[PDB]
Amino acid sequence: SGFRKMAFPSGKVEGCMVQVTCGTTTLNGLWLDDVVYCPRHVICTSEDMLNPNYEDLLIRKSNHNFLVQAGNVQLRVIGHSMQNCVLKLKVDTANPKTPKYKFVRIQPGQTFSVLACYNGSPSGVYQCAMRPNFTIKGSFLNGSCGSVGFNIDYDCVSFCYMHHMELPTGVHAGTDLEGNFYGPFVDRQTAQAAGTDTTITVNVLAWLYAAVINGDRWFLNRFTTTLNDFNLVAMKYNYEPLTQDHVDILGPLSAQTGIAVLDMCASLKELLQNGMNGRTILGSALLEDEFTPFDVVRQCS
Amino acid sequence: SGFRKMAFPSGKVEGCMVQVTCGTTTLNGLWLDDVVYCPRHVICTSEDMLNPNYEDLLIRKSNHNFLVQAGNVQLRVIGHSMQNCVLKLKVDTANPKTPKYKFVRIQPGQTFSVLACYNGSPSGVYQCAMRPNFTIKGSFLNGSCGSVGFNIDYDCVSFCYMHHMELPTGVHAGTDLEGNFYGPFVDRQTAQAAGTDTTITVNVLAWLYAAVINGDRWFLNRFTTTLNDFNLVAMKYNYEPLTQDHVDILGPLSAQTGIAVLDMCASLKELLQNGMNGRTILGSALLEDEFTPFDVVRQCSG
Ligand SMILES: *[C@]1(C(=O)O)C[C@@H](c2ccccc2F)n2ncc(C(=O)Nc3ccccc3F)c2N1
Ligand SMILES: *[C@]1(C(=O)O)C[C@@H](c2ccccc2F)n2ncc(C(=O)Nc3ccccc3F)c2N1
């Protein structure tokens, strides 16, 4: 029993973290096979980040203008390229600790573990959700760029995120491992608007099932609802619309608890309209939306 | 910016997790040098846990009755001994992945990372606080016993906790790495009272400092208090009394934010007496106490 925000064991990813330096700038890199991936803004100086011309800046750089360090040992760059917003520094030696890996571009509402790093060294690990507005609510300080997000499937590491910036509003933005930003963000020191964020409805319902499995049932009510009627309330409270796909994804949790998905929706409608009235669910005074149905199943089983 | 419950990277601990089987019972073990550490209840059957005589049960066990497996590598058990509530199985080979380590008995209020494991395989990592009543609020299922809690200092792993049981109340109990339980708990399937739990006051104040560093300052007030005055409110609200030692440990955060500790105490007093009025602090509608002043410094600067 007990329900916790749980990150994946980070060992397979720790062995891939390197320090990347280009002039005065030092950030983190991911060494997989003979390639080191890192944010391309590593090639920018203070007077460049307002509107950098990355193609021009990268031309002024040579393979030897990048110092890559894995622990104490220095790696040698034999070819540099730019793929969207990521720099790919090809090194002469393959990382012997390269795990079985995949690059995946996750969907909003999905979760992953962040291995926060500083100077190529892992500092901590925590679980994040990709918000519906494509930002993440992380914990990042200067030097944390190049830190990655990932999921594990048995022995396969699926890398899905690379940290690129903290927006002026304190929220975090980054790319997939092909350098494509999640959301409308760009790699420049400019005020950028994140969309209106919404609550991940299917994740709140999954967490309500996690609470039922762990003994917290006070919120289960005599009322019920329809999918279209529930969405009327959800739209008022800035919750993302619930589809039949979301109901289907919730099927295994519904079966384990004996609680119909629409009945759990009925309980959630009353929690939104009437609030929690100073009560807690799984140790929280707010409705939690950063656990997917898969996160609940794998933690409870 | 941002504030999160952050665990230590678990790689150095993953290389130490093994599977330990004794008859039908399988749980996790910790392999450091040529010793495998695990809960002594591994030698019990379902109908032994009511009141086991561990010394008598262990006498019926020989080295070959313990099957120890690190991945697919089978370890050969050449010695066995019981130290308090842990079994120490001597194996014929040193773990090549043994990191630099220490065994520590943490104090109540201190935090640590838990690497939850099943069948000797790691499944997740999360941070826990050793509650003032010596329980932890974790996430453990059947098969999780033998999972460890730890802290990392540079390259050194300080193992502080081994999981042994979930009480009927749903909370978790275990030992340090010398097999001494935290709290009054025993390793038997019996109803056991965890005392009244109290809130770690120094940790709540540290998190209020973390909130101010992150821009959350609505709760800051034009009031001040004294140590004894604050403590009359802390005793009313089941918060542990604040001492000058806690004040001193908060020193760095007070210096960084420019907010005196007794002034932060006055804000906490107003929050205890008036609630949060439906507002949030660092993404929470509750006062948080599972972050120490060290956890705040490591994250807010580091
Ligand atoms: C990242 C790096 O490590 O190089 C760090 C990251 C950052 C900075 C400060 C606090 C947290 C945090 F995650 N970061 N944000 C922005 C940038 C950057 O290179 N440029 C920049 C500056 C200001 C606003 C937007 C922007 F893109 C970095 N660098
Ligand atoms: C642990 C093991 O893996 O052997 C598992 C742990 C447990 C059980 C169920 C849910 C969560 C959880 F952490 N556990 N709790 C108790 C015990 C045990 O061996 N005996 C027992 C049973 C009930 C209460 C106390 C008690 F000691 C285990 N074993």
XYZ file of C-alpha atoms and ligand atoms in Angstrom:
661
model
C 0.000 0.000 0.000
C 0.803 3.686 -0.328
C 0.922 5.778 -3.458
C 3.944 7.799 -4.393
C 5.221 9.920 -7.285
C 7.808 7.418 -8.405
C 10.569 7.890 -10.911
C 12.221 5.065 -12.942
C 15.553 3.674 -11.653
C 18.040 6.021 -13.302
C 21.189 3.861 -13.554
C 21.007 3.130 -17.308
C 20.745 6.914 -17.988
C 23.446 7.962 -15.438
C 26.012 6.062 -17.482
C 25.149 8.231 -20.529
C 25.590 11.716 -18.935
C 28.576 13.781 -20.094
C 29.708 17.431 -19.686
C 29.693 19.493 -22.943
C 31.632 22.760 -23.241
C 31.842 25.253 -26.120
C 33.767 28.353 -25.068
C 32.419 29.785 -21.813
C 29.221 27.663 -21.971
C 29.050 24.337 -20.081
C 25.915 22.122 -20.130
C 24.936 18.396 -20.086
C 25.105 15.939 -22.952
C 23.769 12.420 -23.641
C 26.370 9.950 -24.960
C 24.774 7.029 -26.847
C 26.988 4.847 -29.116
C 29.501 7.268 -30.802
C 27.226 10.375 -30.616
C 26.826 13.076 -27.906
C 23.493 14.917 -28.013
C 23.075 18.329 -26.348
C 21.084 21.636 -26.763
C 22.445 23.668 -29.704
C 22.352 26.877 -27.560
C 25.654 25.572 -26.049
C 27.352 27.405 -28.995
C 25.805 30.789 -27.915
C 27.377 33.525 -25.775
C 25.480 36.157 -23.634
C 25.242 38.609 -26.603
C 23.760 35.837 -28.885
C 20.677 34.392 -27.102
C 18.273 37.280 -28.058
C 18.164 36.185 -31.753
C 20.832 33.598 -32.535
C 21.576 32.567 -36.133
C 22.472 28.982 -35.251
C 23.608 28.077 -38.784
C 26.077 30.993 -38.795
C 27.195 30.375 -35.207
C 27.823 26.668 -35.869
C 29.905 27.534 -38.967
C 32.326 29.577 -36.780
C 32.815 26.325 -34.707
C 35.283 23.491 -35.379
C 35.055 19.812 -34.161
C 37.827 20.695 -31.658
C 35.902 23.759 -30.302
C 33.764 21.320 -28.214
C 35.190 19.822 -25.046
C 33.265 16.644 -24.071
C 34.074 15.052 -20.666
C 32.777 11.719 -19.286
C 33.889 11.576 -15.650
C 37.606 12.387 -15.736
C 38.269 11.123 -19.308
C 38.070 13.505 -22.270
C 36.239 12.419 -25.463
C 37.317 13.495 -28.990
C 34.776 15.031 -31.459
C 35.201 13.705 -35.074
C 32.139 15.333 -36.715
C 29.566 17.934 -35.637
C 26.043 18.438 -36.942
C 22.811 20.176 -35.988
C 19.482 18.349 -36.088
C 16.727 20.923 -35.465
C 17.599 22.319 -31.940
C 20.074 19.540 -30.979
C 23.761 19.415 -31.593
C 25.123 15.985 -32.439
C 28.835 15.795 -31.604
C 30.049 12.493 -33.115
C 32.866 11.080 -30.947
C 35.543 8.492 -31.923
C 34.510 5.982 -29.229
C 31.210 4.283 -28.503
C 29.871 4.574 -24.933
C 30.462 1.118 -23.443
C 27.606 1.770 -21.014
C 25.104 2.535 -23.873
C 21.846 0.787 -22.846
C 19.221 -0.534 -25.293
C 17.496 2.702 -26.238
C 14.857 4.413 -28.385
C 14.056 8.029 -29.125
C 10.340 8.709 -28.724
C 8.235 11.877 -28.973
C 5.662 11.635 -26.193
C 2.068 12.946 -26.231
C 0.784 15.654 -23.840
C -0.572 14.071 -20.653
C 2.059 11.302 -20.718
C 4.662 11.091 -17.919
C 8.413 10.460 -17.697
C 11.364 10.611 -15.327
C 13.794 13.524 -15.421
C 17.428 12.921 -14.513
C 18.435 16.473 -13.446
C 22.176 16.978 -14.105
C 24.829 19.698 -13.510
C 28.322 19.650 -15.240
C 27.609 16.186 -16.657
C 26.898 14.789 -13.174
C 23.496 13.379 -12.114
C 21.994 15.249 -9.129
C 18.481 13.873 -8.727
C 15.495 12.130 -10.320
C 11.750 13.008 -10.377
C 8.607 12.203 -12.368
C 7.093 14.846 -14.741
C 4.045 14.987 -16.969
C 4.181 16.713 -20.346
C 1.458 19.354 -19.690
C -1.356 19.726 -22.295
C 0.369 23.111 -23.119
C 3.699 21.238 -23.789
C 5.556 22.749 -20.807
C 6.794 20.705 -17.817
C 6.793 21.716 -14.144
C 10.321 20.672 -13.232
C 13.075 21.770 -10.884
C 15.972 23.087 -12.887
C 18.810 25.537 -12.087
C 21.455 27.101 -14.420
C 23.650 24.381 -15.918
C 20.713 21.864 -16.008
C 20.285 22.103 -19.836
C 20.854 18.848 -21.659
C 19.241 16.921 -18.731
C 16.961 14.238 -20.175
C 13.532 12.706 -19.587
C 12.914 9.027 -20.212
C 10.721 5.998 -19.583
C 11.919 2.362 -19.168
C 10.257 -0.720 -20.814
C 12.001 -3.694 -19.163
C 15.556 -3.111 -20.407
C 14.821 -0.441 -23.071
C 15.335 3.249 -22.302
C 12.923 5.440 -24.244
C 14.342 8.935 -24.180
C 11.580 11.496 -24.763
C 12.863 14.854 -23.490
C 15.934 17.079 -23.407
C 15.914 20.224 -21.230
C 16.575 23.437 -23.155
C 15.136 26.401 -21.205
C 13.338 27.907 -18.291
C 10.861 30.450 -19.681
C 10.546 33.863 -17.917
C 7.375 32.549 -16.181
C 9.404 29.809 -14.395
C 8.006 26.937 -16.496
C 10.279 24.580 -18.462
C 10.575 23.858 -22.168
C 12.601 21.417 -24.175
C 12.759 19.117 -27.148
C 12.495 15.408 -28.123
C 15.908 13.725 -28.938
C 15.600 14.785 -32.629
C 15.720 18.490 -31.465
C 12.050 19.250 -32.110
C 10.631 21.432 -29.305
C 7.539 20.300 -27.530
C 5.063 23.196 -27.938
C 5.523 26.567 -29.644
C 8.827 27.308 -27.913
C 12.066 28.410 -29.566
C 15.670 28.457 -28.308
C 16.086 32.184 -27.816
C 16.173 34.425 -24.673
C 12.783 35.945 -25.319
C 9.423 36.204 -23.564
C 7.386 33.279 -24.951
C 3.737 32.582 -24.208
C 2.789 29.104 -23.052
C -0.819 28.203 -23.891
C -3.611 28.099 -21.292
C -2.815 24.884 -19.374
C -5.578 22.377 -18.751
C -5.922 19.523 -16.248
C -5.270 15.984 -17.580
C -8.720 14.508 -16.838
C -7.823 10.834 -17.539
C -4.868 11.149 -15.128
C -7.098 12.589 -12.330
C -9.484 9.641 -12.796
C -6.538 7.152 -12.769
C -5.312 8.716 -9.460
C -8.858 8.512 -8.008
C -8.723 4.734 -8.804
C -5.237 4.613 -7.118
C -6.911 6.180 -4.032
C -9.752 3.626 -4.064
C -7.200 0.716 -4.305
C -5.321 2.249 -1.313
C -8.347 2.724 0.979
C -9.527 6.307 0.299
C -13.196 5.967 -0.815
C -14.970 8.992 0.839
C -15.340 10.721 -2.560
C -17.361 7.828 -4.097
C -20.933 9.089 -4.395
C -24.551 7.946 -4.958
C -24.652 10.178 -8.111
C -23.663 9.140 -11.645
C -23.236 10.938 -15.052
C -22.976 10.733 -18.841
C -19.802 11.314 -20.901
C -21.273 14.448 -22.558
C -22.708 15.757 -19.236
C -19.365 15.239 -17.421
C -17.565 17.178 -20.192
C -19.864 20.188 -19.567
C -18.487 20.448 -16.002
C -14.899 19.608 -17.112
C -14.945 22.509 -19.639
C -16.025 24.944 -16.873
C -13.086 23.844 -14.655
C -10.382 23.835 -17.326
C -10.199 20.030 -17.486
C -9.387 18.495 -20.875
C -12.428 16.768 -22.512
C -12.752 13.076 -21.716
C -12.984 10.850 -24.836
C -14.079 7.141 -25.184
C -10.329 6.397 -25.734
C -9.689 7.684 -22.177
C -12.591 5.530 -20.831
C -11.091 2.451 -22.621
C -7.594 3.191 -21.207
C -9.210 3.299 -17.716
C -10.867 -0.141 -18.267
C -8.361 -2.275 -16.262
C -8.585 0.044 -13.207
C -12.399 0.056 -13.455
C -12.301 -3.815 -13.444
C -9.881 -4.063 -10.509
C -12.002 -1.761 -8.310
C -15.519 -2.660 -9.474
C -16.179 1.066 -10.164
C -17.625 2.032 -13.575
C -15.623 4.811 -15.337
C -18.772 7.023 -15.571
C -19.383 6.532 -11.779
C -15.778 7.684 -11.123
C -16.564 10.654 -13.474
C -19.691 11.323 -11.294
C -17.483 11.413 -8.163
C -15.031 13.769 -9.958
C -17.903 16.082 -11.069
C -18.898 16.506 -7.373
C -15.250 17.092 -6.305
C -14.962 19.883 -8.947
C -18.308 21.596 -8.178
C -18.280 21.112 -4.409
C -14.511 21.086 -3.803
C -12.779 18.706 -1.389
C -14.089 20.633 1.714
C -10.786 20.359 3.591
C -10.312 16.619 3.078
C -7.348 14.761 1.514
C -6.993 12.050 -1.144
C -3.743 9.984 -1.035
C -2.111 12.679 1.154
C -2.988 15.558 -1.187
C -5.337 18.519 -0.695
C -5.564 19.078 -4.528
C -6.721 16.797 -7.379
C -3.519 15.229 -8.863
C -3.141 14.920 -12.671
C 0.479 13.767 -13.169
C -0.202 9.991 -12.845
C -1.302 8.201 -16.019
C -3.478 5.001 -15.871
C -0.277 3.058 -16.755
C 1.599 4.682 -13.833
C -1.197 3.603 -11.438
C -1.290 -0.002 -12.750
C 2.474 -0.524 -12.652
C 2.825 1.008 -9.162
C -0.175 -0.854 -7.694
C 0.996 -4.153 -9.367
C 13.258 27.560 -10.498
C 10.698 24.920 -9.519
C 10.509 22.702 -6.482
C 10.069 18.993 -6.602
C 10.360 15.956 -4.361
C 13.641 14.696 -5.812
C 15.295 11.368 -5.125
C 19.032 10.571 -5.486
C 20.110 8.921 -8.771
C 19.722 5.211 -7.983
C 22.471 3.664 -10.153
C 24.946 2.942 -7.322
C 22.179 1.149 -5.351
C 20.788 -0.796 -8.390
C 24.134 -2.541 -8.828
C 23.723 -3.903 -5.243
C 20.213 -5.413 -5.512
C 19.921 -9.180 -5.380
C 17.107 -11.741 -5.054
C 17.130 -13.862 -1.870
C 15.091 -17.070 -1.576
C 14.765 -19.368 1.448
C 12.332 -22.166 0.742
C 9.188 -20.635 -0.725
C 9.867 -17.043 0.445
C 11.587 -14.618 -1.980
C 12.543 -11.004 -1.182
C 15.342 -8.487 -1.885
C 18.862 -8.398 -0.553
C 21.630 -5.782 -0.597
C 25.030 -7.118 -1.820
C 28.038 -5.061 -0.561
C 31.560 -6.608 -0.762
C 31.107 -10.397 0.035
C 27.993 -9.955 2.221
C 24.293 -10.037 1.252
C 21.983 -8.245 3.767
C 18.242 -9.035 3.921
C 15.249 -9.094 6.367
C 15.531 -12.105 8.681
C 11.787 -12.823 8.069
C 12.937 -14.433 4.724
C 13.261 -17.717 6.798
C 9.571 -17.569 7.895
C 6.554 -19.301 6.366
C 3.095 -17.589 6.231
C 2.069 -19.361 9.501
C 5.393 -18.508 11.293
C 5.039 -14.655 11.194
C 2.468 -14.596 14.092
C 5.292 -15.079 16.677
C 8.431 -16.515 15.082
C 11.327 -17.817 17.166
C 14.006 -16.563 14.718
C 16.920 -18.315 16.479
C 15.097 -21.690 16.257
C 13.955 -21.126 12.661
C 17.459 -20.125 11.535
C 18.975 -23.244 13.194
C 16.971 -25.386 10.717
C 18.692 -23.438 7.843
C 22.068 -24.334 6.268
C 24.093 -22.188 3.712
C 22.573 -24.162 0.742
C 18.969 -23.339 1.801
C 19.608 -19.680 0.760
C 19.498 -19.028 -2.955
C 21.044 -15.700 -3.865
C 20.812 -14.357 -7.392
C 22.294 -11.099 -8.837
C 20.687 -10.797 -12.298
C 21.347 -14.238 -13.781
C 24.554 -14.748 -11.680
C 23.980 -17.315 -8.948
C 25.948 -16.541 -5.795
C 27.303 -19.270 -3.565
C 26.444 -18.808 0.160
C 29.459 -19.782 2.382
C 28.239 -18.356 5.720
C 25.077 -17.111 7.408
C 24.436 -15.113 10.574
C 21.662 -13.037 12.120
C 22.363 -9.511 13.377
C 19.305 -8.080 15.173
C 16.521 -8.367 12.470
C 18.849 -8.832 9.392
C 20.434 -11.865 7.848
C 23.991 -11.576 6.601
C 24.749 -14.223 3.998
C 28.438 -14.477 3.257
C 28.983 -15.174 -0.452
C 32.140 -16.490 -2.203
C 32.539 -13.379 -4.409
C 32.736 -9.641 -3.736
C 30.186 -7.487 -5.657
C 32.323 -5.833 -8.335
C 29.819 -2.943 -8.335
C 30.093 -2.224 -4.567
C 30.179 1.579 -4.399
C 31.904 3.553 -1.622
C 29.412 3.109 1.289
C 28.574 3.677 4.923
C 25.789 2.330 7.161
C 23.956 5.100 9.047
C 21.098 5.335 11.542
C 19.211 8.478 10.488
C 17.383 10.713 12.962
C 13.596 11.317 12.790
C 12.892 14.231 10.425
C 15.793 13.320 8.099
C 14.988 12.322 4.509
C 16.288 9.610 2.159
C 15.671 7.925 -1.212
C 13.941 4.549 -1.481
C 14.756 2.182 -4.320
C 11.607 0.005 -4.327
C 12.482 -3.512 -5.658
C 10.691 -6.797 -6.460
C 12.542 -10.144 -7.016
C 15.896 -8.316 -6.798
C 14.975 -5.929 -9.617
C 14.560 -2.155 -9.121
C 11.162 -0.708 -10.112
C 11.170 2.890 -8.887
C 12.754 5.637 -6.836
C 11.126 8.175 -4.486
C 12.093 10.315 -1.490
C 10.821 9.564 2.057
C 11.095 11.249 5.417
C 11.691 9.154 8.553
C 8.614 10.466 10.465
C 9.033 11.646 14.101
C 7.077 8.434 15.050
C 9.753 6.336 13.129
C 7.504 5.134 10.308
C 7.714 6.085 6.641
C 4.896 6.792 4.174
C 6.176 4.859 1.158
C 4.870 2.695 -1.645
C 5.624 -0.935 -1.077
C 3.751 -4.081 -2.249
C 4.282 -7.773 -1.365
C 7.830 -8.657 -2.473
C 9.233 -5.176 -1.645
C 10.913 -6.268 1.657
C 14.659 -5.869 1.539
C 14.305 -2.631 -0.523
C 16.678 0.031 0.873
C 16.695 3.743 1.673
C 19.859 5.796 1.267
C 21.527 9.163 0.766
C 24.466 9.994 -1.515
C 27.406 12.291 -0.534
C 29.508 12.804 -3.676
C 30.591 9.210 -4.400
C 29.561 7.650 -1.010
C 26.233 5.830 -0.477
C 24.929 6.052 3.104
C 22.479 3.211 3.524
C 20.014 4.059 6.226
C 16.881 1.931 5.799
C 15.790 -1.608 4.912
C 12.102 -2.323 4.417
C 10.573 -5.060 6.585
C 6.785 -4.505 6.851
C 3.593 -2.703 6.286
C 1.599 -2.330 9.504
C -2.232 -2.948 9.485
C -2.572 0.858 9.481
C -0.894 0.989 6.019
C 2.307 2.721 7.159
C 5.800 1.230 6.695
C 8.416 0.068 9.131
C 11.934 -1.177 8.908
C 15.450 -1.218 10.198
C 18.860 0.389 9.708
C 21.528 -1.838 8.016
C 22.566 -3.340 11.374
C 18.985 -4.767 11.684
C 17.753 -2.483 14.454
C 14.213 -1.262 13.749
C 13.427 2.411 13.734
C 10.737 2.835 16.388
C 9.098 0.254 18.641
C 8.315 -2.147 15.805
C 8.976 -5.886 15.810
C 9.125 -8.357 12.862
C 5.940 -10.279 13.457
C 2.394 -10.220 11.990
C 0.795 -8.452 14.907
C -1.100 -5.178 15.390
C 1.493 -2.516 16.333
C 0.908 1.038 17.410
C 2.921 3.764 15.737
C 2.727 6.654 18.180
C 1.143 10.014 17.491
C 2.839 11.394 14.415
C 4.008 14.962 14.561
C 4.890 17.449 11.828
C 8.602 18.185 11.303
C 8.506 21.951 12.027
C 12.091 22.669 10.851
C 11.276 20.978 7.481
C 8.013 23.029 7.003
C 9.949 26.272 7.650
C 12.701 25.154 5.205
C 9.993 24.562 2.552
C 8.494 28.023 3.317
C 12.033 29.410 2.563
C 12.096 27.330 -0.702
C 8.690 28.909 -1.552
C 10.058 32.454 -1.010
C 13.147 31.643 -3.198
C 10.711 30.481 -5.954
C 8.561 33.656 -5.799
C 5.698 32.404 -3.579
C 5.494 35.110 -0.875
C 1.751 35.700 -0.101
C 2.064 34.054 3.328
C 4.804 36.478 4.509
C 3.381 38.731 7.207
C 4.112 41.938 9.205
C 4.289 39.858 12.415
C 7.046 38.408 14.469
C 7.075 35.854 17.300
C 9.356 34.327 19.989
C 10.595 30.701 20.237
C 8.338 29.948 23.287
C 5.327 31.789 21.716
C 5.720 29.884 18.415
C 6.059 26.578 20.365
C 2.747 27.133 22.202
C 1.149 27.149 18.681
C 3.332 24.197 17.516
C 2.203 22.082 20.526
C -1.465 22.972 19.752
C -1.105 21.797 16.138
C 0.985 18.606 16.737
C 4.165 20.177 15.342
C 7.528 19.257 16.888
C 8.950 22.016 19.134
C 11.488 24.317 17.475
C 14.898 24.573 19.173
C 17.892 26.979 18.619
C 19.593 24.000 16.836
C 16.774 24.045 14.210
C 17.132 27.899 14.019
C 20.916 27.500 13.394
C 20.338 24.816 10.708
C 17.983 27.311 8.975
C 20.736 30.029 9.042
C 21.835 29.680 5.380
C 18.214 29.946 4.117
C 17.540 32.927 6.383
C 20.704 34.637 4.973
C 19.839 33.905 1.321
C 16.222 35.141 1.624
C 16.925 37.974 4.096
C 14.054 36.654 6.286
C 14.731 36.065 10.001
C 13.696 32.595 11.256
C 11.380 33.989 13.976
C 9.690 36.107 11.218
C 9.164 32.966 9.108
C 7.829 31.286 12.307
C 5.223 34.114 12.628
C 4.005 33.423 9.071
C 3.814 29.685 9.894
C 1.872 30.512 13.094
C -0.722 32.521 11.027
C -0.972 29.617 8.523
C -1.550 27.130 11.395
C -4.243 29.320 12.985
C -5.940 30.602 9.813
C -5.305 27.811 7.288
C -4.302 28.540 3.677
C -7.698 30.058 2.579
C -7.896 27.828 -0.498
C -4.502 29.038 -1.756
C -1.354 27.013 -2.573
C 2.373 27.135 -1.720
C 4.807 25.535 -4.203
C 1.947 23.628 -5.883
C 0.452 22.307 -2.642
C -2.691 23.118 -0.632
C -1.042 21.561 2.518
C 2.000 22.555 4.590
C 4.868 20.234 3.459
C 7.286 18.664 5.960
C 9.248 16.025 4.022
C 12.013 18.461 2.810
C 14.936 19.145 5.161
C 16.991 22.410 5.116
C 19.645 20.359 3.200
C 17.097 19.225 0.582
C 16.063 22.893 0.153
C 19.734 24.155 -0.202
C 20.714 21.334 -2.647
C 17.728 22.195 -4.899
C 17.262 25.984 -4.527
C 20.871 27.003 -5.223
C 23.126 23.958 -5.546
C 20.316 26.116 -19.598
C 21.766 25.674 -19.431
O 22.091 24.973 -18.507
O 22.602 26.068 -20.356
C 19.677 26.252 -18.215
C 18.253 26.818 -18.243
C 17.903 27.421 -16.899
C 18.422 28.645 -16.484
C 18.148 29.145 -15.220
C 17.340 28.439 -14.356
C 16.788 27.231 -14.747
C 17.085 26.753 -16.001
F 16.541 25.572 -16.382
N 18.092 27.785 -19.330
N 16.969 28.546 -19.477
C 17.218 29.341 -20.496
C 18.492 29.118 -21.053
C 19.211 29.772 -22.226
O 20.228 29.269 -22.700
N 18.632 30.902 -22.751
C 17.512 31.656 -22.315
C 17.624 32.652 -21.342
C 16.486 33.288 -20.864
C 15.237 32.955 -21.351
C 15.103 31.971 -22.315
C 16.239 31.354 -22.781
F 16.122 30.405 -23.736
C 19.019 28.085 -20.265
N 20.216 27.410 -20.275
C 7.537 -8.059 2.778
C 8.153 -9.009 1.757
O 8.326 -8.663 0.614
O 8.487 -10.198 2.213
C 6.425 -7.238 2.120
C 5.702 -6.321 3.115
C 4.409 -5.811 2.520
C 3.272 -6.612 2.424
C 2.109 -6.131 1.843
C 2.062 -4.848 1.339
C 3.173 -4.027 1.427
C 4.307 -4.524 2.023
F 5.370 -3.697 2.167
N 5.491 -7.008 4.387
N 4.652 -6.538 5.357
C 4.650 -7.466 6.292
C 5.480 -8.559 5.969
C 5.723 -9.917 6.633
O 6.576 -10.685 6.196
N 4.900 -10.250 7.676
C 3.874 -9.488 8.289
C 2.562 -9.461 7.809
C 1.691 -8.462 8.227
C 2.103 -7.505 9.142
C 3.380 -7.553 9.673
C 4.227 -8.550 9.247
F 5.469 -8.626 9.775
C 6.033 -8.195 4.736
N 6.962 -8.785 3.913
